Amino acid sequence: VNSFSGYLKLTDNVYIKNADIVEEAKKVKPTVVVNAANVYLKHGGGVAGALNKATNNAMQVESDDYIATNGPLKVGGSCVLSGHNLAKHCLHVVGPNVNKGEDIQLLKSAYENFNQHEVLLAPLLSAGIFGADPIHSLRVCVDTVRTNVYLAVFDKNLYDKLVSSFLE
């Protein structure tokens, strides 16, 4: 039903909220939830671990069957699979891991995948252990994505820093 509420409007198409993406998916019932994935779709940590545990591991079981038949994704690439109990679909997107020297320019490629979907619930890509500067990730999202994106950031200090920086 895409019933998003309580978001700050950053641009005509980008919205942001201090919220847990799992709880937002349960409340909103979005058509598409984005996972911040890795190339072999191993959902052990970060956002991916939270989304997978909220599906009682159904996302990992499906991802393993996909990888066995199709092989790993490319950095900057994506894959639509089932959204299970969280959404109709999950768009698994691979942002670059700048802590491992992957090219930060591929963060643009990663957000470009959002343009195939009219409306998405998403986390900030390449944050956590992937090491991209969160303000830079938000700017690449705003400059790249043309469709409607609702960003859930589950850290109040980071949310406030991102909003303050973007409003300068």
Chain residues that interact with ligand A1ANI, rule: CB under 6 A: 20-22, 36, 38, 46-47, 50, 95, 123-130, 152-155, 158
Compute the least distance from the CB of residue 84 to ligand A1ANI, in Å.
Answer: 15
SS3 at position 90: strand
Nearer to ligand A1ANI, 21 or 89 (CB): 21
Compute the least distance from the CB of residue 59 to ligand A1ANI, in Å.
Answer: 14
State both tokens at 136: 């830079």
Nearer to ligand A1ANI, 106 or 124 (CB): 124
**End-to-end CA, the chain:** 34
Residue 102: how many other CB atoms lie within 10 Å: 19
Q: How far apart are CA 64 and CA 40, in angstroms?
A: 8
Q: How far apart are CA 52 and CA 113, in angstroms?
A: 21
Compute the least distance from the CB of residue 87 to ligand A1ANI, in Å.
Answer: 14
Using CB positions, name the residue nearest to ligand A1ANI: 128
Compute the least distance from the CB of residue 36 to ligand A1ANI, in Å.
Answer: 3
Partners of 55 in the β-ladder: none
